[PDB]
Amino acid sequence: RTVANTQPSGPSNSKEIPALTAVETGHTSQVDPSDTLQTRHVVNFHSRSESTVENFMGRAACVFMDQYKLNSTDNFAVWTINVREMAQLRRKCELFTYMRFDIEMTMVITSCQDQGTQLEQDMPVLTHQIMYVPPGGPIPAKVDSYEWQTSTNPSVFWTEGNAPARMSIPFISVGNAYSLFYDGWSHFTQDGTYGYTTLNAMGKLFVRHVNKSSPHQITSTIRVYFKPKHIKAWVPRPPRLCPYINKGDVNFVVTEVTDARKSITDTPH
Amino acid sequence: RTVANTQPSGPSNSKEIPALTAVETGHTSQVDPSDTLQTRHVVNFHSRSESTVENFMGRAACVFMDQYKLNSTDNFAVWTINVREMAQLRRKCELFTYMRFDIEMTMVITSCQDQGTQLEQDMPVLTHQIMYVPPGGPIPAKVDSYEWQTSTNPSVFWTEGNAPARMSIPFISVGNAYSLFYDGWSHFTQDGTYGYTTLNAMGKLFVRHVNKSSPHQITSTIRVYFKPKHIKAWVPRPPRLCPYINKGDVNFVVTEVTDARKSITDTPH
Amino acid sequence: GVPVLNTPGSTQFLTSDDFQSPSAMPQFDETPEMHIPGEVRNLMEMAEVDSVVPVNNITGKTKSMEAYQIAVGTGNTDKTKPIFSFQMDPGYSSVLKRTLLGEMLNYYAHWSGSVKLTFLFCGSAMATGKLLISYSPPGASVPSSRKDAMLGTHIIWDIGLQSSCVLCVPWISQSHYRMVQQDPYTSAGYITCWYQTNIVVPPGAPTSCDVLCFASACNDFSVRLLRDTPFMAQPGKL
Amino acid sequence: GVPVLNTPGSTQFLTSDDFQSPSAMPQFDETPEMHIPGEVRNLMEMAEVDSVVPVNNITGKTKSMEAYQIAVGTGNTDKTKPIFSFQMDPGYSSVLKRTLLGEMLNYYAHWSGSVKLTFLFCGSAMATGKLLISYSPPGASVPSSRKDAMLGTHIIWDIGLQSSCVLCVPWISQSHYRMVQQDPYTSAGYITCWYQTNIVVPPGAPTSCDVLCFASACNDFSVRLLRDTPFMAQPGKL
Amino acid sequence: TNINFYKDAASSASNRQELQQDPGKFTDPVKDLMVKTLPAL
Amino acid sequence: TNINFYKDAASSASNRQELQQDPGKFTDPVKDLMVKTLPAL
Amino acid sequence: SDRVRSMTLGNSTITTQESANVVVGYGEWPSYLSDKEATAEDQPTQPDVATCRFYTLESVQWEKSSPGWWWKFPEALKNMGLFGQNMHYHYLGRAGYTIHVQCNASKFHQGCLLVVCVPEAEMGCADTSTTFPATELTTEEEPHVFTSDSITGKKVQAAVCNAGMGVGVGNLTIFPHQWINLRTNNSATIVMPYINSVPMDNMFRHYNFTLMIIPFAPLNFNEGATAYVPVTVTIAPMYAEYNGLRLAST
Amino acid sequence: SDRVRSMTLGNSTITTQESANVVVGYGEWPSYLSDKEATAEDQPTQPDVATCRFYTLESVQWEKSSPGWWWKFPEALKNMGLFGQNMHYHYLGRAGYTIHVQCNASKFHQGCLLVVCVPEAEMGCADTSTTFPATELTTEEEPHVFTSDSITGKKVQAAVCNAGMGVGVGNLTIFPHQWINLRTNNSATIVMPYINSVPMDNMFRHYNFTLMIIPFAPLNFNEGATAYVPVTVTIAPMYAEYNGLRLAST
Ligand SMILES: CCCCCCCCCCCCCCCC(=O)O
Ligand SMILES: CCCCCCCCCCCCCCCC(=O)O
């Protein structure tokens, strides 16, 4: 599974011109260092492991951080489920237009115990219900609404102090891939929502405290970490140089192509 | 796997002179007690186990202790990842110039609940994010910065009160071994950073509380324990007699070769 | 039941863990997979593919298109001066950091392999000239004379019908994996382009021709240690 | 799922545990292993290799080079006195504690095997003499006469062309493993060097010749119980 | 090891041991085969 | 027992049952073979 | 020779004398949707030559200061023959487009065009807060020009350096790309197959890809050379299959 | 006999009449970097005799009070023939050095030198807070002398007891070591192979090893004996292979 070994080369004066190619063809030259220059026989035990899209997405990264409190809509956290909320994994997922990945969510929830005048009352271990409402499903409006009855909606019901909750999610896109980039309008009139927001509507994630109330306000932070696995990247894209501005669109502020250097001949050190 | 058994010997008056060797050769004499003296046949069931570099490094030892607080740069602990910070494992690793070891880090984190005027507010179980930034990667500047989104950086996200976090790390050195001793400058001009600091730049370890804040200051101590496994020691070195002074250089204060005794003939007891 | 001793790594969320987890929706019929062209099973494939690099990243030109344009001219002035010069290491070099191999390098901490820089002469068809594109391995000063660049690894680019010479940096390193982050120990060499011969042009052709450099990864190329990219900085919630 | 009963050793970080843990970077391509000469697969190998010991560790001489130098002279004075004397146990003996076997002994609590002390005569080539290097097993007083040392294990070193006699302490112990820490029960013997004959020198050679003792481990040598070394003391953060 | 303890296919460990790679999709997408040892034209 | 439950090779128990040893690298590094039963010269 | 090329898709044919090898989109040749990969149960309308022909779009003058142009396909093919008619009269459509960009320049012309088919090139708004209308990115009649610098308003961010998608334009070669270097090439052909997550998608709401022609080296010609150097896109959908006959959408 | 020795590496040859067995560094003979263990794809420059020859360095007088000397190789071989030239003209270099230290002394001379090749002997600064310059440890022209006692300043800790690396000098025999005992030996040869983590490293920034010649027994000679007893290091790199031809570094 290792990369191709550098074949031994020698002096050459021929008509092969391996270095001389044409980018006009659009084909990146398949040349090796043995072609242009003279190289020794180096057996490359180096392997393109951890560079696989499966391994690259294997690193779990946050996609959703929100603060929901105990003792309105601030007692539970609502997440329009998209990878684009957090820039760290968004740019990874935006390296490819289509990724057919089974996403492994690992919720990390930490209670904060908000600083108040009175904080001398100790609440028992806080259980957390991370319910997933599929798109078009019943969206709860209160922390005790009927939607929290998980007849069909999956829910971990994670309790604090245990191992972080983790529920692997299959490939749920209506299409055959998750369109991270989708230059398309929601409506056929070409008017509406432009971007990944249209196709990447995978429901919502409502996070609440299973505990009814606490003597003092406790604002637990739900840190959702998305680990893509069984990924099928299908159309590669460059990383977005510009910083992410909107989580529902690719809208960006202009950014330099690279870090500017003093001169075209400016080589530090 | 046991050590060589003491072969039976007897009286000898020959020209073999096993005791008579030459240290001028640089070869340590391979003589046995049967050679110099007369010994009985002793089957040595003793084995050189627990003396193996694999077993010797098997004992996990601290390499990084720092205090990071909850409720600036003091809310997360930064570790330039090197074994040399703690002298106990550093001298073990400095017994060999090159060690190709898969390092097994076992973070031990204990909250302190800093003594303050008010400490009557009980915070829920504190989750701890131990993120590893590879060398040249994005280094966080705040406890809530975008770097903490672990798109690619590995992170245990350990929660307090559970089993101590442990993430085995492969051999990540750019070279074929970890140069514990490296008498080399960072730059080819022979000016810059001299020592292991040059080659042993294996990134940084940022430890933070996943919990956003606490009503009262809590300063958890991150005690990183490094267990080398699958070690390949390649160039043995003596233990450093002098106490360690700098964690980025071998710089030392002069120390006696051994504990001085009253006389060359001074034998206690 | 079964006696189980919890390892000291229990109840932790390691980011890079191959741990099976219960399915959110069991027996969920995933949409049938279709053969979408271009299946990326490794991002070293997108590193291998060519990418115009911002060689002329002088102040202001990064905003415009002239960052990639490597200016060449039919003038005797500054002919003994490099057409360009920059650091070979795609991790931290300003030219190569935001290119395809560089962008897929700053997502990692260690990189190994032969960067190949394809140089496309974007000038007049009758504009013929010889350049000397040279990778100088580290340990010495940046080449300040064409002879110094010739002393290192180099290729003479005779601009013609092909119009693209590939300078393949032959992985001249003292370690199996150079480090993506800027460190003098695994500091790479210097890629400098000079004039082996002037860019001779007919009277009806522009003298100020342009060159595009395509830094691409060879089959040797690999990255070993993943890390969050320093380029993608998120000031706050989007 | 599977009924699992947690053992009373669950959720603990035992330092000496062979417990598998999730990989920090899964499928990480480690740099290919190369045959670096000197592969240490056991530190009893570095114990076995010779090491100059500070026999003459009298006050002040540990700072200088005379700690290893064992002074011998062509003088009738103090000929009935030991050239040197020290404790055999490398764990706590001042001479042998910081040597290769001793330094790889204080990293352990129990030690077993035959220490072999190679004695190199670092004097004039024409300086010929006979020494009596004697390991006396414990249970009796330290030898105060050459006859007492002769009564124990001893080797006569006839200094000549070889110039190095190896006094191999034949592991005269009442237990399979002596304890590295200073305890009278596993207290080792006493290694004392005397003059079997004076160091006869020609008139043109120095009388005050020097001897170097190389305490080395034999094939029998082993250590059984690991412990943090008392030598490496860390007052605070570096 | 490689044993899948969950019935659902998605509820399995990531296929981190698959290093299949076809750079020819991106590096060599031309219809006519291009050999480095001949002029590209 | 010896079963490796993690795919990565580094994510395995330490090889504490390997007692391979070659002291001849350090104790006998001379080019010409030296036998204890003959003068070293 | 590889420089000469001839593509006879449908009634219209394209013959070129200086054209490098055609860039098959991501190495896979376009084809009709297979029964295995088909999710629509309607009978597919497959005009082999009525719609699968070379459509010559509006030619845009490559000025010296031109930073770039983009066409949004298949919406750029509206009102272009029976391909556009089938777009209007069908809910779902799939096509593999072998775009052929013709830039006839003399041997004294300096310039280079990255003709790159970016699948799903989601364009960024000039003002990040708002979203641009459809007219700003749609390419029904004229190519939408990338601006040399940043623009503002309810439009598409046309910064050529960011390619309008916040992406490094020099890295746009990651997508199926061919270079029209007037030194060597005068025409680039990219045979891009149908590229989308869903096997068939509507051809109005969703643009299957965007053909971005980015002059990396601006057109440079001395006085006396032809100043009107046209960049003519001739795109031929291949294996075009449509499901869901419906009322014409306008 | 084992006392006589003859090494003919390259043009220069070394013949000795009282020289013990040569200490092959860690028991492995030096050799050219194999393709399996090679990470640099450049063609290796392998001068079999141009660089792989015995270079006689500056001879230092072994005084009675001399505590020791050290040479930092391969940087001590700068300006020494084509080995130094290849060092200057190459980014990466590998060599196995068979150092030969010549100490000709009569039969009436008392002394003993631990000639030990310490791989990667990281030297400690005299003041722990600061770091010494390159001149303090580099051995381009003259050996750097270990001081008998502790020194201070922006220099290298030259305490002979600590060997400059905080390490017991008597334990330095752990590294490939040979003893020049004037009773028996007048010359020590250590055939140390290339010892580094990376298969090839730069020969300026990194010193592959340090040859420390530590007089454990100080030179002792009665009046009338030759007072100028020289310690002459004659080091011959073997199987020297260089990758990365570049501009000369000075
Ligand atoms: C708590 C159990 C159920 C968990 C369900 C939460 C995850 C829903 C599925 C997410 C699909 C992938 C992310 C959105 C699509 C994308 O932009 O790639
Ligand atoms: C939290 C998961 C990731 C853990 C990463 C932390 C360990 C990084 C690798 C350490 C390499 C060995 C120590 C430095 C090199 C050395 O001096 O031996």
Residue numbers in the entry:
A (entry chain A), B (entry chain A): 6 to 76, 81 to 278
C (entry chain C), D (entry chain C): 1 to 238
E (entry chain D), F (entry chain D): 28 to 68
G (entry chain B), H (entry chain B): 10 to 259
What does the study report here?
Echovirus 18 (E18), as a member of enterovirus species B, is a significant causative agent of aseptic meningitis and viral encephalitis in children. Echoviruses belong to enterovirus species B (EV-B) of the Enterovirus genus within the Picornaviridae family, which are single-stranded, positive RNA viruses (~30 nm) without a lipid envelope (nonenveloped virus). We describe the mechanism for the entry of certain EV-B serotypes by using FcRn as a two-in-one attachment-and-uncoating receptor. Protomers consist of the capsid protein (VP1, VP2, and VP3) and the smaller internal protein VP4.
Detailed characterizations of mature E18 particles, the E18/FcRn complex under physiological conditions (pH 7.4), and the E18/FcRn complex under acidic conditions (pH 5.5) were performed. To investigate whether soluble FcRn could induce E18 virion uncoating in vitro, E18 mature particles were incubated with FcRn under either neutral (pH 7.4) or acidic (pH 5.5) conditions at 37°C, and the virion morphologies were then compared by negative-stain electron microscopy. When incubating mature E18 particles with FcRn-decorated liposomes at acidic pH, the particles are first bound to the liposomes and then transformed into empty particles and released from the FcRn-decorated liposomes. When the pH of the complex was reduced to pH 5.5, rotation of the residues around the hydrophobic pocket that play a key role in stabilizing the pocket factor was observed. The rotation of these residues further displaced the pocket factor from the pocket of VP1. The release of the pocket factor was further accelerated when the pH was lowered. Accompanied by pocket factor release, FcRn dissociates from the virus particles, and the unstable virus particles initiate uncoating. The density of FcRn around the particles was observed and compared to that of the complex at pH 7.4.
